[PDB]
Amino acid sequence: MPQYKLTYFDIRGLGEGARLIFHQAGVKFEDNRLKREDWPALKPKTPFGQLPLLEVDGEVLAQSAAIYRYLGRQFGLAGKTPMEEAQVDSIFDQFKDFMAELRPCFRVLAGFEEGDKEKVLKEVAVPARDKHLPLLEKFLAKSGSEYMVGKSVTWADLVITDSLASWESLIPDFLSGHLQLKKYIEHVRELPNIKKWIAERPKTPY
Amino acid sequence: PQYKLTYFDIRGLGEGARLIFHQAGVKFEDNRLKREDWPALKPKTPFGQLPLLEVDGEVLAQSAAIYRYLGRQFGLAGKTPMEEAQVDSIFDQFKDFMAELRPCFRVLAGFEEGDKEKVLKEVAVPARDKHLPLLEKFLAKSGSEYMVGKSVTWADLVITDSLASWESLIPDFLSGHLQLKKYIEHVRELPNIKKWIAERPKTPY
Numbered sequence A: 001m002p003q004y005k006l007t008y009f010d011i012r013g014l015g016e017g018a019r020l021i022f023h024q025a026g027v028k029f030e031d032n033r034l035k036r037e038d039w040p041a042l043k044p045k046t047p048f049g050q051l052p053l054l055e056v057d058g059e060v061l062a063q064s065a066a067i068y069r070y071l072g073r074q075f076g077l078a079g080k081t082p083m084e085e086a087q088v089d090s091i092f093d094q095f096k097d098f099m100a101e102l103r104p105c106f107r108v109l110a111g112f113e114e115g116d117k118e119k120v121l122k123e124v125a126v127p128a129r130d131k132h133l134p135l136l137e138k139f140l141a142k143s144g145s146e147y148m149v150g151k152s153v154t155w156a157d158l159v160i161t162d163s164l165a166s167w168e169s170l171i172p173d174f175l176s177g178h179l180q181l182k183k184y185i186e187h188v189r190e191l192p193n194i195k196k197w198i199a200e201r202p203k204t205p206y
Numbered sequence B: 001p002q003y004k005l006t007y008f009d010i011r012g013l014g015e016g017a018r019l020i021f022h023q024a025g026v027k028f029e030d031n032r033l034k035r036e037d038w039p040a041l042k043p044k045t046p047f048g049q050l051p052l053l054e055v056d057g058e059v060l061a062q063s064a065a066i067y068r069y070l071g072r073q074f075g076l077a078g079k080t081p082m083e084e085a086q087v088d089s090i091f092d093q094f095k096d097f098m099a100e101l102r103p104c105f106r107v108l109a110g111f112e113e114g115d116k117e118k119v120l121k122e123v124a125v126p127a128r129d130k131h132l133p134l135l136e137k138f139l140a141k142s143g144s145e146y147m148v149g150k151s152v153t154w155a156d157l158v159i160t161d162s163l164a165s166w167e168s169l170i171p172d173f174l175s176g177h178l179q180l181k182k183y184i185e186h187v188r189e190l191p192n193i194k195k196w197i198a199e200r201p202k203t204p205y
């Protein structure tokens, strides 16, 4: 019977991954969404000067992926064997590589930063998309099941599909050409607890 | 359990796995691949990249996933679920640091054209000044000589090895951080590590 507090900004972003993992498992936690007002005071008190942070009975854990994995293993959403857990880690790291291409160009694409959206799409987004999506889809085809690894949902599934779904809003036809991913995203987000959470969670830009 | 690590001749991302094996005294095929063989292998890999670890025939990709898998197998991952997550956390912070530098490696090394001085002042030195204190802070809270717990973990082995390599490419890379240097020495003092460091193929990186 452990007590959980997640500290992140109002947006979904990196924090949403943890939230999704809680709601899937049906585990209650404090969704501490932090006001911009309070960030300057908290920042120097954090391990690395950033959020998200997970508090577990007082103890602090930083870095989102470490948070995802910790929650995943605690809730049996990490894989049924040691090699499976690794395969889960593996596919998410590849997703992380993909994100490493896109995220630095997010704000120009969202319009928050001055720049040539059309250029970025052709010179950064669409090439990244074209390289990485086939690799995620290939991996997904190993399984034959509806998930990247195993016959049931894992934490990597929850975080990946949510992020891809959101990026579909910034980039038209982002998933066009990859229906196996489109189904995969449709499936995970139709899971009852996820489906519920998506309906109730705050509407934020990203 | 037959262990086979596939990577290129250089240390790079593959070295992390090698260090974890040697520290645990576990035997493995250190398969270092010729450039000549990369075009044929690449399409037959999960993500088109190395390193790969295969154990009894099954292939595992992505270096960090390889580090953690091996570390957990050899009791080098942490002593509790929270300690394990903490090992992941400090290493993820370390990857963020590397994410700043690694894209600038080839210019700093001279494999690609560019102003080395400008890169140092505008990217390398800033990245260093932001991140080293964070690593040093995390190490300082530990009390022990390692990032987490009282014994060495896979994150210690990969971090210290990587930090040691970057001394070369960045002037005074660890100048104002006596704690980090001592920690790098200590982890690399460990018998199996000191041994492997001496035996391993002399590559620059």
Ligand SMILES: N[C@@H](CCC(=O)N[C@@H](CS)C(=O)NCC(=O)O)C(=O)O
Pocket: A013, A014, A043, A049, A050, A051, A052, A062, A063, A064, A065, B092, B096
């Ligand atoms: N590698 C970190 C990245 C965390 C991160 O970049 N957080 C941003 C928000 S997405 C942040 O805290 N910005 C405020 C700041 O850095 O001062 C992780 O995965 O958790």
Ligand SMILES: N[C@@H](CCC(=O)N[C@@H](CS)C(=O)NCC(=O)O)C(=O)O
Pocket: A093, A097, B012, B013, B042, B048, B049, B050, B051, B061, B062, B063, B064
């Ligand atoms: N995210 C991957 C990165 C692996 C990677 O970038 N490998 C490079 C060498 S360091 C490679 O395979 N280059 C050959 C190629 O991609 O075709 C990991 O951590 O394992």
